[PDB]
């Protein structure tokens, strides 16, 4: 079946000229249909930017401030969203699409003059029948980020909380509940990954 995968540079400064990629498989972008770029802002509002026909001709949203175009490469079977001078207000998640019936996961574009930062990973060990621990990933930029428990083996009774931005730094916490007989007789380690800063951290939760 038809699959679409977005990719992009992640973080960029204002006035930066830039391009996003949609790689299509299982279906040719020359064959048929219209191939779209759609944008989701925080607050979850969706906005249609444009498409490129299968003829290589384009149609755009004339009601936008953003300067952009859409292009393709029929041979690698990709199409592209080129943004000409991003502003802060271009921050959001960008989706690519065949019409409306097939979407990519999405790719996050952050437009900031803030500098990349590796996070501090902090272990939250306790002070009943079950038990609760925690991870505090603080002061990183940008996202995304990656948190698992015991290398992702442990996934039950976990709660990863959406990051929250304070002074151009993100903070993210994680919860996980296990049975008293489990900890700390068995080791529970927290697994942090911030690709942006090429950081990978593993923090085992010790008691006290």
């Amino acid at each position: 079946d038809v699959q679409l995968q977005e990719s992009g540079p992640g973080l960029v400064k204002p006035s930066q000229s830039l391009s996003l990629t949609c790689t299509v498989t299982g279906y040719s972008i020359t064959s048929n249909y219209a191939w779209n770029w759609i944008r989701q802002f925080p607050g979850n509002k969706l906005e249609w930017m444009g498409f490129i026909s299968s003829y290589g001709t384009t149609t755009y949203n004339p009601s936008l401030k953003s300067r952009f175009s859409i292009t393709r490469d029929t041979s690698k079977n990709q199409f592209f969203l080129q943004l000409h001078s991003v502003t802060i207000e271009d921050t959001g998640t960008y989706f690519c699409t065949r019409e409306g019936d097939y979407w990519g996961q999405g790719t996050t574009l952050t437009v900031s003059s803030a500098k990349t930062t590796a996070p501090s990973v902090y272990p939250l060990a306790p002070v009943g029948s079950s038990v609760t621990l925690g991870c505090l990933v603080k002061g990183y930029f940008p996202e995304p980020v990656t948190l698992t428990w015991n290398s992702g083996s442990l996934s039950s009774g976990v709660h990863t909380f959406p990051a929250v931005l304070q002074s151009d730094l993100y903070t993210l916490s994680s919860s996980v509940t296990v049975t008293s007989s489990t900890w700390p007789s068995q080791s529970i380690t927290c697994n942090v990954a911030h690709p942006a800063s090429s950081t990978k951290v593993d923090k085992k939760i010790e008691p006290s």
């Binding site: 969706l46 149609t59 009601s63 501090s120 902090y122 505090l136 603080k138 990863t160 909380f161 919860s175």
Partner: protein, 216 residues
């Protein structure tokens, strides 16, 4: 530009019950070709939007017959006949009769459930963090319902309200429960200058606040 209004914004419904979402258009969406290119998507948490209904009433592959769409001129309805859990998220209408293509603002579908009180946990600053001159106190409020929930952060009996970071999860479809996290952050100084750290939670499930604490 064609504006689409969705009703309502939120929408609690019981498992097994029929839900319906309404979308209203600022213009007729009838093409010359006689077709009404009004379509329906669902965005599950953490996922990308997914096509349910296209051209008003045509159901996309793999989409359960439970899902149906109808409507009349400038009013449109999506019906979900026998609500299951997987069904939770944000529902969007869109139009493609007119350029530019526009989306409705979305309608969050919440699953009705048995009121449930948070499982609270309080957490002291790490050694590591303490070393750096940082002091963060974390409080988890897990697996509660409904979503409405206030927290207070008390230091030595009285209430702090500067340096509080709150984060809520989307509704868990595994049990229809929500979850929150709150982080109070102070200077290693401001910290070691007080004894008691209290995390107070207010909620329908209790006429009284749920209290978790510790002594530094």
């Amino acid at each position: 530009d064609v504006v689409l209004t969705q009703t309502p914004l939120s929408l609690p419904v019981s498992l097994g019950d029929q839900a319906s979402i309404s979308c209203r258009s600022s213009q007729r969406l009838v093409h010359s070709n006689g077709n009404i290119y009004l379509h329906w998507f669902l965005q599950k948490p953490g996922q990308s939007p997914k096509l349910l209904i296209y051209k008003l009433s045509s159901r996309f592959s793999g989409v359960p017959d439970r899902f149906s769409g109808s409507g009349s001129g400038t009013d449109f309805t999506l019906k979900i006949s026998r609500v299951e859990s997987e069904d939770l998220g944000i529902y969007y209408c869109s139009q493609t009769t007119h350029v530019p293509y526009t989306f409705g603002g979305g309608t969050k579908l919440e699953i009705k459930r048995a009121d449930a009180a948070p499982t609270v946990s309080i957490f002291p600053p790490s050694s590591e963090q303490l070393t750096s001159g940082g002091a963060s106190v974390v409080c988890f409020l897990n697996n509660f319902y409904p979503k409405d929930i206030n927290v207070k952060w008390k230091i030595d009996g009285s209430e702090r309200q500067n340096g509080v970071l709150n984060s809520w999860t989307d509704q868990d479809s595994k049990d229809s429960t929500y979850s929150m996290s709150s982080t109070l952050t102070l200077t290693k100084d401001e910290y070691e200058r007080h004894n008691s750290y209290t995390c107070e939670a207010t909620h329908k499930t209790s006429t009284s606040p749920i209290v978790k604490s510790f002594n530094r």
